[PDB]
Amino acid sequence: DFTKNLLTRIKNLHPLTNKSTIHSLLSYVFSRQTQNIACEPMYIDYRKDETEAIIRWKTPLHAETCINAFRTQERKQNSHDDIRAHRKKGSSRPFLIAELITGEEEKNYWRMLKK
Numbered sequence: 001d002f003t004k005n006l007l008t009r010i011k012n013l014h015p016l017t018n019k020s021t022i023h024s025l026l027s028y029v030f031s032r033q034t035q036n037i038a039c040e041p042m043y044i045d046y047r048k049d050e051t052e053a054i055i056r057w058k059t060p061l062h063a064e065t066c067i068n069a070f071r072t073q074e075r076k077q078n079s080h081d082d083i084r085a086h087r088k089k090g091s092s093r094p095f096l097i098a099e100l101i102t103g104e105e106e107k108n109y110w111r112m113l114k115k
Contacts, residue, residue: 007109022053025085029069030065066098075095078093
């Protein structure tokens, strides 16, 4: 038993970032996507020196807003502590991507959390 559609994978984070910066970046981007709901990334699963994180959002609406935000906004983290993540001309950094985790990978997230 779990609430479906809460989880978003964020890809192409700066490898030397941290959970606090990810939280601020997500909130900054979320606020440009909507002012109707607040940014509530309840848990951020992130390991230092990785370029991906899994976000457990408070509700499915939050997760959907996150997906829409990164699809419509070009963002690239320029340093480990960059929150606003403006793409720079000529930068070799890739664009931040957010994907909803579904299917067996979603089931396994909750199974491993409860292990």
